[PDB]
Design a protein around this ligand. Structure first.
Ligand SMILES: CCCCCCCCCCCCCCCCCC(=O)OC[C@H](COP(=O)([O-])OCC(O)COP(=O)([O-])OC[C@@H](COC(=O)CCCCCCCCCCCCCCCCC)OC(=O)CCCCCCCCCCCCCCCCC)OC(=O)CCCCCCCCCCCCCCCCC
Ligand SMILES: CCCCCCCCCCCCCCCCCC(=O)OC[C@H](COP(=O)([O-])OCC(O)COP(=O)([O-])OC[C@@H](COC(=O)CCCCCCCCCCCCCCCCC)OC(=O)CCCCCCCCCCCCCCCCC)OC(=O)CCCCCCCCCCCCCCCCC
Ligand SMILES: CC(C)=CCC/C(C)=C/CC/C(C)=C\CC/C(C)=C/CC/C(C)=C/CC/C(C)=C/CC/C(C)=C/CC/C(C)=C/CC/C(C)=C/CC1=C(C)C(=O)c2ccccc2C1=O
Ligand SMILES: CC(C)=CCC/C(C)=C/CC/C(C)=C\CC/C(C)=C/CC/C(C)=C/CC/C(C)=C/CC/C(C)=C\CC/C(C)=C\CC/C(C)=C/CC1=C(C)C(=O)c2ccccc2C1=O
Ligand SMILES: CCCCCCCCCCCCCCCC(=O)O[C@H](COC(=O)CCCCCCC[C@@H](C)CCCCCCCCC)COP(=O)(O)O[C@H]1[C@H](O)[C@H](O)[C@H](O)[C@@H](O)[C@@H]1O
Ligand SMILES: CCCCCCCC/C=C\CCCCCCCC(=O)OC[C@H](COP(=O)(O)OCCN)OC(=O)CCCCCCCCCCCCCCC
Ligand code: HEC
Ligand code: HEC
Ligand code: HEM
Ligand code: HEM
Ligand SMILES: CCc1nc2ccc(Cl)cn2c1C(=O)NCc1ccc(N2CCC(c3ccc(OC(F)(F)F)cc3)CC2)cc1
Ligand code: FES
Lengths: 139, 524, 75, 105, 218, 185
């Protein structure tokens, strides 16, 4: 993919420019020196876009043309078998209930509720991860 | 031991009843152990209570403590409270034993309730078994009252408040008999001298005896009317498919017994229940904030809390409010044992039944049961008003009114949702019967179309679509991995692999044995 | 009693019909019971308005169902 | 003991107008529902709360119940002082104390 | 330098006059008079943090001997009770612990346990209000609490509850909040509700999980 | 079909968002260091560098072990994967135990969360990283248990790879935190 990488490179360039400009303009001309709270956010949003763009760049350099990236193409090119898309599942609502229990137990300071919520989150996430890998029962 | 076995055989010659009992077949469903749980809890209760009777003194005479527990020295208390304190602090391992006793009582009640839920929802109470249902209901009532009389024995402040309020002042208010019952039971006015010995005699001798007789009768009826079963591949109304007692079933039952005893010991050692020393001896002038009976009487307490103050005053007389609680509790206790006859009168079905129903195939009964469970949960939560309003910052009057209104609007809402949910499950089953099992794989079909690659459960027609099956009351698979689709991991241990020959041989013999089991059970 | 299979697929495997008169009368009775609960020691009227508001919704639903069933739009 | 500030919001039930001695009132402590000690007293709402099932009586209105399954008022005891300055009882309750039964309150 | 309450009436004027008045007169909208009250009321209300209020317990705003400043300034305008002091002039902590726990516990169960608990946990009152937990309050706070009678809590004078009685109650409270549970993990201090919950959510799930493991499903 | 991996893209963008979270925490830390003039680590607080070096080297060795496990996973054998991931789990557990020990020995005689500003920002910055490490440990255990229950397919390889570079992100942000707190001061 060539255009996504270019988008992220544009964003990273602008963010780095803005971060450096803000840092050096608040080093002077400011009440107490460098501002130290917007500077950090700016360098690390630059780092975010940089990470994403670099990953996309490597994947693009390690890839041959794709029917999506390619113009000139027809629908007989993508004829094949896509991945695995999960049909019906009921684990998400249980995960959300467990996380909400832990959150309300953290709002009102109740340690037992926090412990129960964490245990339920571990259980529900385990159920979600193993859903399509449990084998038949051994009897 | 040939000599001993033969001499037993010429003196008794059973040799045929033993063979008839060693070949009995029992179905193997995880849901058929919820009664074993209650049975094992009862056994543990018997053992620990027999241990406890060697140290308890059930008197109501007053003494001064003069013991080892210092923050209570010089306080005047009854003899039962002092005996309980002596069990707790002066016998090596007594606190552990009474904590096991209380935890086992709680597990007894909970297991009974879960077992009743199973029996009701699967429909195992129909024509041949109404009387067994009735015996079970009586056992439930007796267990409730036995636990109550039990935790009211070491008379401290909480037990005293419970006794006073419930027993004394609800028996005192009955319309005509009333005070006569109160004086026959207490020997006089509320704080007497014969209450605790009478409760002790009722609790260690009478109710355990009645419960033991009823449990014997229950298990006999279950043994001679063979167990029910779920519909399946080789199951009919005329046979029992499972495992014989001889090698397997006794083994599984004993292992389950040991595991339940282990759980009870662990949670009787690690969690604290009923610390009577933090309380004080019962005195009619002081009170605390919790109140609260054990969780199997909380519905009675909640019903007393959220019932409005409706009294009737006519000529020279008075009918107080707790009369309402009395008739409602009696109505519940009368409507529980008489349900199978009501259902057979209303549906008009009087045939023998040995195959169970899935709860999704009977929407109306499932909705009724869900409504009753919602009602019970509302009544139980209305009993911990103080704790809820204190921990979660809610008004107290707010919780009272929430319970008072929920008592009317939650059951019907639950009924509606449960009915619609059951029918939705039925439709989801019919869809996988008509088509195949969804695999989750997508294709693009060169003229840009997306299909999803179902997998048939039976034969197929000329153009690849499966011919629809018929429903047979048995569950259907929904995930491709539950059918053998992606399996067979390596055959190492956890970090080092085995040889290839061993892996191939084990995999291949396992596959063969699976196929043979399937083909054998189909054909019968 | 009887229900067609196209509404309840497993209509021959168990009880699946409850007559509608039971539901209508039960709704009316529950509304009446909510109303009669203004007799007591309620000083303050914040609670009475919830009783009146929940008894109007039940009556509205019961009346809607009855009127639609009477004109054939349902069943 | 009622604060002298209010002493004007008292209602004084029909038969017990002289059962109080100044700012002392001396109601009973056995709840008129099922007999638990109604000991929770809120000093500036003048409400008595029974902790067993949460009834509420109005200490300024002859202990009239204003919440819950409680339906009858708490009994009041007449008090006075003797020739030495100690608090004594000026008689007996006008009615039975505690829960009700078939015969009467 | 006791003739210095110019501090005191420097903090009150900038943190209290909007709800009590410039002359401690009780703005007829929000606050009470604060004239008959003394140093003990101010100490209990500010040290626990219930004071200056936007009433729950919060973090305190004032120390570095300014609780003394406001207390002396308020005591100079009335005759309320005063805070106990040790031979150094500081507030007594250790001298307010009695030596008899039986009498203290009996007095607690008769007078105090109705609203709080058997062992000093919380309790719920009507329409909002509750009775807090007695664990984090120190000794002088307990004494001044039962001496000044804060909102909706009764007032126990030194004539109906003598000073020994108060010291013994303090000792019982401080011992009941700091003793072990010699039976395992206590489930919060309350009765059978946490016990029933722990049963249903530990023992029954263990039993049903083992039943699912042992027995087949069909 | 699907020449670039999907789980990879998802994990990458999520790791970017997590970086922004830690940015917020860093911004909290740098302020209140500009205000404290002089010995801005207060007198009762001084950091024991004799313990913070070994745990950092242990974490770096963990990163190496995880990369070796992924190398073993890309060729379809489960046992090399299992061995290297068990080693990584053990080293991460050792790191967490060392961090907890330093917390104990440092709260013993001084610095607390409600007792200072430096202690507040220090505990807040390092405890969230500890929570992330614990989450990574849970992910390792779940992945091993999942490889135990079916045959090895490319999906298992993809899961291993994404868990791997989550771990890498964790032990890189740790290097950042360490160099900022213990040396720069
Ligand atoms: C002139 C011609 C006009 C032209 C026509 C124009 C059409 C419309 C114009 C009319 C203008 C009015 C417009 C006003 C607005 C309407 C309001 C409204 O939306 O109503 C919902 C209305 C309902 O749809 P519908 O067309 O009436 O459906 C047909 C019936 O469902 C079919 O099913 P049914 O009715 O046959 O089933 C009966 C059902 C009726 O249910 C319904 O149809 C809906 C109402 C149920 C909701 C909650 C359940 C009841 C709880 C009450 C309190 C709730 C608070 O009764 C129940 O089962 C309820 C439970 C009863 C419990 C009884 C217990 C029995 C056991 C006995 C034991 C004894 C113990 C005694 C104690 C127990 C106490 C009882 O339409 C919808 O909005 C939903 C449509 C489908 C749902 C899609 C998702 C919706 C998302 C929500 C956002
Ligand atoms: C307020 C807001 C409202 C919330 C809405 C309520 C949430 C409900 C979400 C779960 C729904 C479960 C479900 O419908 O499964 C359908 C299930 C069968 O589904 P199916 O598609 O026909 O598959 C059957 C085939 O034979 C094919 O069967 P299969 O072999 O392919 O697999 C079926 C499945 C067995 O299918 C089941 O029956 C699963 C039963 C799970 C019950 C849900 C627990 C609650 O296999 C299993 O055994 C796996 C489950 C093993 C035990 C479950 C572990 C529970 C972990 C809990 C951790 C999270 C903590 C909870 C939240 C914490 C704070 C609230 O039948 C049921 O409907 C079960 C009834 C549960 C409904 C009542 C539960 C909530 C009641 C009030 C909540 C308040
Ligand atoms: C009054 C009754 C009838 C209704 C009021 C209940 C309700 C209004 C309270 C919470 C409402 C809530 C905020 C609504 C939104 C939440 C929603 C979106 C999902 C989350 C719901 C969850 C978190 C509800 C929690 C379940 C809770 C109500 C059950 C509590 C069980 C009992 C009463 C707790 C008692 C208790 C237990 C059980 C302990 O184990 C324990 C252990 C150690 C110390 C203390 C305790 C302790 O006090
Ligand atoms: C099945 C149905 C009850 C039969 C109906 C037959 C006929 C209608 C009889 C009429 C009865 C009607 C009129 C009134 C009902 C109320 C009355 C009968 C009460 C008597 C007691 C008896 C009948 C018990 C009813 C059945 C019982 C409640 C089964 C519930 C348990 C089952 C279904 C699921 C349990 C699964 C369990 C392992 C996980 C649940 C986890 C927790 C949240 C369970 C919930 C929970 C419970 C259930 C507590 O009791 C509890 C008590 C104290 C503190 C907390 C809790 C608590 O959290
Ligand atoms: C009807 C059954 C209800 C249960 C009791 C039995 C009948 C009650 C019948 C009843 O109502 O009164 C009874 C009349 O005594 C009795 O026969 C004793 C019981 C035996 C009944 C008659 C004998 C059976 C042949 C009790 O009156 P008594 O406690 O003596 O005096 C009261 C004052 O306190 C109070 O001032 C007031 O004047 C009344 O409450 C008065 O009864
Ligand atoms: C919010 C999380 C913030 C930071 C997490 C990292 C924890 C860092 C651990 C280090 C703590 C420390 O060393 O501080 C010693 C102090 C000495 O204070 P003290 O008064 O003198 O002692 C008297 C004690 N009562 O104890 C303490 O504050 C106790 C610390 C409390 C434990 C941390 C809470 C974890 C809860 C997780 C929330 C999950 C909710 C999810 C729902 C969405
Ligand atoms: C209007 C907001 C408000 C502010 C600001 C405020 N108070 Fe209060 N104060 C109240 C209210 C309302 C009460 C009534 C007590 C209650 O109901 O809890 C009260 C009660 C008191 C009491 C106890 C009264 C009694 O009779 O026992 C004292 C003492 C007190 N305040 C002093 C202070 C002090 C010291 C400050 C800090 C300079 C302060 N107040 C600031 C509102 C306020
Ligand atoms: C239900 C009536 C009631 C009685 C009786 C009662 N309390 Fe209180 N108590 C309260 C209320 C309400 C508060 C909260 C006052 C506030 O927050 O301003 C409180 C507060 C307290 C506090 C402050 C707790 C804290 O953490 O700051 C202590 C200490 C205390 N009471 C001790 C006692 C003692 C000792 C007794 C027995 C002599 C007693 N109480 C009797 C209701 C009561
Ligand atoms: C069968 C069902 C039983 C139930 C539900 C039950 C329940 C209880 C409970 C909850 C207690 C309170 C214990 C405590 O709080 O310390 C108790 C006390 C007691 N139980 Fe049981 N019990 C049963 C059977 C038995 C049996 C069969 C015996 C004797 C053979 C027995 C002997 C005792 C004794 C002596 C006490 C009082 C000792 C004490 O309180 O420490 N119980 N019972
Ligand atoms: C102390 C109380 C009880 C004990 C010890 C108990 C025990 C048992 C046991 C061990 C079984 C056979 C195994 C199983 O079904 O899992 C069983 C079955 C049965 N129970 Fe209970 N139960 C009790 C209460 C009840 C209640 C409350 C009811 C209602 C009830 C009705 C039934 C019925 C109808 C059966 C037959 C089920 C079948 O044959 O499939 N029992 N009981
Ligand atoms: C209000 C309940 C309650 N509040 C609190 C508050 C605090 C605490 Cl700690 C506990 N509680 C509880 C409490 O303990 N609830 C359990 C309970 C409830 C009722 C009964 N029953 C006894 C026999 C009666 C009876 C007996 C014979 C009769 O004669 C006839 F007609 F022939 F049958 C009629 C009625 C009925 C009620 C037992 C236990
Ligand atoms: S006992 Fe006082 S309210 Fe029922």
């Amino acid at each position: 993919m060539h255009i996504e990488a270019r988008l992220f490179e544009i964003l990273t360039a602008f963010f780095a420019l803005a971060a450096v400009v803000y840092a050096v303009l608040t080093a002077m001309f400011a009440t107490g020196g460098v501002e130290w709270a917007g500077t950090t956010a700016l360098v690390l949003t630059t780092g975010l876009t940089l990470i994403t763009g670099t990953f996309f760049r490597f994947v693009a350099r390690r890839l041959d043309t794709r029917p999506e990236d390619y113009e000139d193409a027809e629908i007989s090119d993508g004829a094949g078998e896509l991945g695995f898309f999960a049909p019906h599942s009921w684990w998400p609502i249980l995960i959300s209930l467990s996380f909400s229990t832990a959150a309300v137990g953290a709002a009102l300071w109740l340690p037992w509720l926090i412990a129960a919520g964490v245990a339920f989150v571990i259980t529900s996430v385990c159920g979600l991860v193993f859903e399509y890998y449990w084998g038949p029962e051994k009897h | 031991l040939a000599r001993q076995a033969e001499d037993i055989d010429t003196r008794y010659h059973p040799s045929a009843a033993l063979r008839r009992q060693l070949n009995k077949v029992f179905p193997t469903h995880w849901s058929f152990l919820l009664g074993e749980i209650a049975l094992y809890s009862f056994v543990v209760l018997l053992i620990t209570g027999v241990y406890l009777t060697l140290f308890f003194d059930p008197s109501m005479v007053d003494v001064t403590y003069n013991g080892v527990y210092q923050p209570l020295r010089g306080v005047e208390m009854s003899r039962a409270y002092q005996s309980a304190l002596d069990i707790s602090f002066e016998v090596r391992g007594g606190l552990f034993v009474r904590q096991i006793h209380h935890w086992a009582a709680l597990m007894f009640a909970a297991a009974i309730m879960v077992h009743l839920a199973r029996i009701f929802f699967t429909g195992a109470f129909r024509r041949p078994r109404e009387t067994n249902w009735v015996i079970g209901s009586l056992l439930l009532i007796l267990a409730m009252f036995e636990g109550y009389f039990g935790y009211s024995l070491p008379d401290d402040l909480l037990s005293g408040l419970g006794l006073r309020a419930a027993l004394s002042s609800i028996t005192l208010g009955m319309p005509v008999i009333g005070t006569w019952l109160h004086w026959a039971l207490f020997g006089g006015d509320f704080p007497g001298t014969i209450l605790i010995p009478r409760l002790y005699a009722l609790h260690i001798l009478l109710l355990p005896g009645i419960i033991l007789a009823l449990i014997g009768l229950h298990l006999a009826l279950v043994w001679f009317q063979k167990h029910t079963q779920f519909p399946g591949p080789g199951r009919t109304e005329h046979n029992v498919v499972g495992v014989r007692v001889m090698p397997v079933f006794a083994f599984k039952s004993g292992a389950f017994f040991a595991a339940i005893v282990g759980v009870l010991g662990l949670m009787g050692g690690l969690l604290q229940i009923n610390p009577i020393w933090n309380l004080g001896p019962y005195k009619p002038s002081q009170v605390s904030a919790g109140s609260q009976p054990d969780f199997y009487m909380m519905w009675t307490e909640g019903l007393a809390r959220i019932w409005p103050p409706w009294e009737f005053y006519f000529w020279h007389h008075t009918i107080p409010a707790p009369v309402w609680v009395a008739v409602i509790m009696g109505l519940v206790f009368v409507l529980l044992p008489a349900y199978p006859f009501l259902e057979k009168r209303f549906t008009g079905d009087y045939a023998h039944h040995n195959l169970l129903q899935r709860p999704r195939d009977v929407p109306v009964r499932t909705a009724i049961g869900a409504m009753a469970i919602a009602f019970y949960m509302v009544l139980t939560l209305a009993a911990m008003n103080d704790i809820i309003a204190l921990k979660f910052h809610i008004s107290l009057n707010a919780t009272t009114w929430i319970g008072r209104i929920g008592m009317v609007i939650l059951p019907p809402f639950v009924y509606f949702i449960t009915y619609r949910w059951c029918i939705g499950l039925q439709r989801s089953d019919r869809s996988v019967l008509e088509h195949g099992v969804e695999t989750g794989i997508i294709k693009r079909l060169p003229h840009g179309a997306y299909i999803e690659l179902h997998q048939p459960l039976g034969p197929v027609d000329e153009h690849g679509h499966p011919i629809p099956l018929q429903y047979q009351g048995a569950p259907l698979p929904k995930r491709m991995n539950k059918l053998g689709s992606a399996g067979s991991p390596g055959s190492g241990s956890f970090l080092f692999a085995d040889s290839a020959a061993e892996d191939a041989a084990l995999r291949e013999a396992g596959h063969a044995a699976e196929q043979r089991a399937l083909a054998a059970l189909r054909e019968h | 009693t009887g229900v067609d299979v196209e509404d309840v697929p497993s209509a021959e495997w168990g009880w699946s019909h409850m007559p509608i008169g039971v539901m209508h009368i039960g709704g009316l009775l529950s509304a009446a019971f909510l109303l009669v609960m203004m007799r007591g020691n309620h000083v303050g009227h914040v609670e009475d308005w919830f009783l009146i508001g929940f008894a109007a919704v039940i009556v509205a639903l019961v009346g809607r169902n009855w009127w639609l069933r009477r004109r054939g739009w349902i069943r | 003991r009622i604060k002298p500030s209010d002493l004007g919001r008292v209602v004084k039930r029909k038969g017990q107008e002289s059962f109080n001695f100044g700012e002392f009132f001396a109601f009973t402590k056995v709840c008129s529902h099922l007999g638990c000690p109604s000991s929770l007293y809120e000093q500036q709402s003048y409400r008595i709360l029974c902790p067993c099932h949460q009834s509420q009586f109005d200490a300024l209105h002859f202990a009239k119940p204003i919440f819950g399954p409680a339906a009858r008022a708490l009994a009041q005891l007449p008090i006075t002082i003797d020739t030495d300055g100690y608090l004594v009882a000026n008689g007996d309750f006008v009615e039975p104390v505690g829960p009700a039964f078939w015969e009467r309150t | 330098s006791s003739a210095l309450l110019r501090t005191g009436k420097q903090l009150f004027d900038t943190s209290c006059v909007s709800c009590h008045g410039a002359n401690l007169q009780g703005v007829p909208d929000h606050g009470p008079s604060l004239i008959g009250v003394g140093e003990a009321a101010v100490y209990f209300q500010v040290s626990t943090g219930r004071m200056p209020a936007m009433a729950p317990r919060k973090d305190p705003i004032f120390d570095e001997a300014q609780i003394d400043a406001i207390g002396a300034y308020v005591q100079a305008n009335g005759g309320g009770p005063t805070v106990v002091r040790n031979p150094d002039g500081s507030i007594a902590t250790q001298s307010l612990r009695g030596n008899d726990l039986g009498r203290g516990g009996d007095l607690f169960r008769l007078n105090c346990a109705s609203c709080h608990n058997f062992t000093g946990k919380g309790g719920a009152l009507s329409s909002g209000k509750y009775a807090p937990d007695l664990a984090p309050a120190n000794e002088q706070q307990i004494l001044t609490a039962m001496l000044t009678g804060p909102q909706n809590m009764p007032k126990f004078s030194n004539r109906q509850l003598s000073f020994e009685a108060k010291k013994d109650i303090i000792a019982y409270v401080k011992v009941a909040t700091e003793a072990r549970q010699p039976g395992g993990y206590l489930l919060g201090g309350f009765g059978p509700a946490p016990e029933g919950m722990a049963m249903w959510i530990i023992g029954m799930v263990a039993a049903i999980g083992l039943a699912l493991w042992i027995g087949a499903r069909s | 079909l699907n020449r670039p991996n999907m789980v990879s893209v998802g994990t990458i963008v999520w790791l970017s968002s997590e970086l922004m979270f830690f940015a917020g925490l860093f911004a909290m830390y740098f302020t209140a260091r500009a205000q404290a003039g002089g010995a801005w680590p207060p007198e009762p607080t001084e950091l024991n560098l004799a313990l913070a070096v070994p745990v950092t080297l242990v974490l770096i060795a963990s990163s190496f072990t995880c990369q070796m496990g992924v190398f073993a996973a890309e060729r379809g054998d489960v046992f090399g994967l299992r061995r290297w991931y068990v080693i990584t789990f053990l080293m991460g557990l050792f790191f967490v135990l060392g961090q907890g020990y330093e917390y104990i020995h440092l709260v013993e005689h001084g610095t607390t969360i409600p007792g200072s500003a430096y202690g507040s920002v220090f505990y807040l910055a390092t405890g969230f990283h500890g929570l992330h490490v614990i989450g990574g440990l849970v992910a390792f255990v779940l992945l091993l248990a999942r490889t135990k229950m079916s045959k090895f397919t490319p999906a298992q390889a993809t899961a291993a790879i994404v868990v791997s570079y989550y771990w890498h992100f964790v032990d890189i942000v740790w290097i950042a935190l360490f160099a900022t707190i213990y040396f720069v001061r």
